[PDB]
Design an enzyme around this catalytic site. Structure first.
Site, PDB file in Angstrom:
ATOM      1  N   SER A  40      40.588  42.860  36.558  1.00 30.42           N
ATOM      2  CA  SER A  40      40.032  41.543  36.850  1.00 30.42           C
ATOM      3  C   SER A  40      40.227  40.989  38.265  1.00 30.42           C
ATOM      4  O   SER A  40      39.596  39.983  38.622  1.00 30.42           O
ATOM      5  CB  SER A  40      40.536  40.536  35.839  1.00 30.42           C
ATOM      6  N   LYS A  73      37.269  40.235  40.203  1.00 31.49           N
ATOM      7  CA  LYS A  73      36.800  38.859  40.173  1.00 31.49           C
ATOM      8  C   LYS A  73      36.954  38.079  41.483  1.00 31.49           C
ATOM      9  O   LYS A  73      36.059  37.329  41.840  1.00 31.49           O
ATOM     10  CB  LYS A  73      37.375  38.106  38.969  1.00 31.49           C
ATOM     11  N   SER A 102      39.623  34.409  33.301  1.00 31.57           N
ATOM     12  CA  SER A 102      39.116  35.758  33.551  1.00 31.57           C
ATOM     13  C   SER A 102      37.978  36.095  32.577  1.00 31.57           C
ATOM     14  O   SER A 102      38.160  36.884  31.671  1.00 31.57           O
ATOM     15  CB  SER A 102      40.263  36.786  33.468  1.00 31.57           C
ATOM     16  N   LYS A 152      45.750  35.684  40.769  1.00 31.97           N
ATOM     17  CA  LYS A 152      44.731  36.132  39.827  1.00 31.97           C
ATOM     18  C   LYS A 152      45.168  37.425  39.150  1.00 31.97           C
ATOM     19  O   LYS A 152      45.717  38.328  39.799  1.00 31.97           O
ATOM     20  CB  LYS A 152      43.368  36.307  40.517  1.00 31.97           C
TER      21      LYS A 152
END
Ligand SMILES: *[B-](O)(O)[C@@H](C)NC(=O)c1ccccc1Cc1ccccc1
Ligand SMILES: [Co+2]
Ligand SMILES: [Co+2]
Length: 466
Positions: free
Chosen positions: A49, A52, A298, A410
């Site tokens: 992720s 992202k 996410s 993140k």
């Protein structure tokens, strides 16, 4: 500290969890530009992720922090005296938050603008994007779950976290021996139900399974559920998310006194319609507000929708291939050097992606120097915070430590992949880091990630609470 801080991270990074694994760990002061720690910072690894971050920045670049998505309803002409029309179109243009209530209000408009009847067929038009619904190398066996949600221009988002392409499946026990009641929620009368589920004796073997057998639009429940057990909600995907949106909108219309005499199904607004009548429209919140439930939690839908949106903006091509070229491009234009990036998707879900901790930190650098920077900041989880919309995927990590309410990072997780990357703001300056663990034989090395994150937080002028 510096070399002292280096020693501290050198200590952390030997941990028996990281045995047999590669780790890009890179730290940089936003202000001084100086590098404060590096190790395998140029090694190619799957981000899960963390991908992202790349998608989020690109989207901010290519669409702007105030971009809004549209849905609309159209017929060839205005309704006729007794309030009639032939065919009718619900048209998605990539709104990653379009909700069942939004549909309702749009239905109410179609009524309000004179329509008593759709005397022909209702189409769900999702042609703003192509119809490649899943990435080449996504795993088949993941498909029933939310994060594998099909990708479609027209797609209904469930609940405040705006998870797309799903339905909530309710499973509620009866008594021992008796079967269990299963609800498909929004997907009722759209998807098939095959309920072989059964309430078992109180406090016994929980063995429930909610599935959608590959290639089917059937919800398969099987196994047992104990009578004393709490009702299981559960998020599950459906095939053709726009067809579901079609169905929900039929429901919406009939529920506002608009009778639909024909079939619901997929269709594009014909080219021969030159003066189409836009009976109703809706507009999502701007991209800034959308980034929160996206990045916090996410959300794969949103990511991959935005890639196809980047696709439509830069090329008029609502497609991964174009979206993705428009991602590389955006980033290069941001100063980011993408030499080590391999783009397969926008969410990180693809195993086919690759990144490097410098490419991350690079991006983090360029992002905090941006008209949007601030809204970029507002999207990332903030460690140890209860309120899901502040904590995101970090709500239950680094609690009661220096990093709690401070670190802006993140997450990225997969069988053999972990990642933490963001900002360490504080009195003694801002700071930027990437930690990308890859190939570790056990559970995601979160303790290492957190221990390093707190280190930096203290290094910024923070203290562990008491
Ligand atoms: B990202 O959060 O790493 C994202 C691409 N991962 C997933 O969607 C994923 C992959 C495989 C199994 C489960 C999930 C869901 C998940 C995992 C960790 C955090 C959030 C969501
Ligand atoms: Co229904
Ligand atoms: Co503090």
């Amino acid at each position: 500290r510096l070399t002292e801080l280096r020693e501290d991270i050198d200590a952390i990074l030997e941990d028996p969890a990281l045995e047999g694994a590669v780790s890009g760990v890179v730290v940089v002061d936003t202000a001084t530009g100086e590098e404060l720690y590096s190790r395998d910072g140029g090694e190619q690894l799957l981000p899960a992720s963390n991908m992202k971050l790349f998608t989020a920045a690109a989207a901010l670049e290519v669409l702007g922090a105030d971009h809004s998505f549209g849905t609309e309803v159209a017929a060839e002409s205005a309704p006729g005296r007794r309030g009639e029309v032939q065919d009718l179109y619900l048209v998605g243009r990539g709104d990653p938050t379009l909700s069942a209530e939004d549909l309702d209000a749009m239905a109410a408009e179609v009524a309000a603008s004179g329509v008593r009847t759709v005397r022909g067929d209702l189409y769900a038009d999702d042609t703003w994007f192509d119809s490649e619904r899943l990435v080449d190398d996504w795993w088949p066996e993941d498909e029933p779950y939310a994060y594998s949600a099909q990708i479609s221009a027209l797609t209904v988002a469930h609940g405040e976290r705006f998870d797309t392409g799903v339905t909530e499946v309710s499973v509620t026990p009866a008594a021992e021996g008796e079967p269990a009641d299963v609800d498909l929620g929004a997907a009722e009368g759209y998807a098939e139900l095959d309920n072989r589920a059964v309430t078992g004796a109180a406090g016994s073997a929980n063995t429930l399974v909610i599935d959608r057998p590959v290639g089917t639009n059937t919800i398969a429940v099987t196994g047992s559920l104990p009578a004393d057990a709490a009702p299981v909600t559960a998020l599950r995907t459906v095939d053709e998310p726009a067809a579901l949106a079609g169905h929900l909108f039929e429901e919406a219309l009939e529920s506002n006194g608009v009778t639909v005499k024909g079939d619901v199904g997929l269709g594009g607004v014909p080219a021969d319609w030159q003066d189409a009548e836009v009976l109703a429209d809706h507009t999502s919140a701007e991209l800034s507000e959308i980034l929160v439930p996206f990045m916090k939690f996410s959300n794969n839908g949103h990511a991959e929708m935005l890639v196809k949106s980047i696709g439509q903006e830069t090329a008029g091509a609502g497609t991964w291939d174009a979206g993705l070229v428009g991602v590389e491009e955006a980033l290069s234009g941001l100063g980011v050097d993408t030499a080590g990036l391999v783009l397969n998707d926008g969410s990180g879900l693809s195993r086919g992606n690759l990144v490097t901790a410098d490419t991350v930190v690079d991006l983090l650098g360029q992002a905090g120097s941006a008209p949007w920077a601030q809204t970029w900041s507002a999207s990332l989880p903030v460690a140890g915070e209860s309120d899901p919309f502040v904590g995101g995927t970090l709500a239950n990590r680094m609690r009661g430590t220096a990093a709690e309410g401070v670190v802006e990072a993140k997450t990225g997780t997969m069988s053999g992949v972990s990642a933490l990357s963001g900002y360490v703001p504080g009195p003694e300056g801002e700071l930027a880091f990437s930690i990308v663990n890859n190939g570790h034989s056990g559970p995601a090395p979160l303790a290492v990630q957190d221990a390093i994150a707190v280190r930096l937080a203290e290094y910024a002028g923070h203290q562990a609470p008491e």
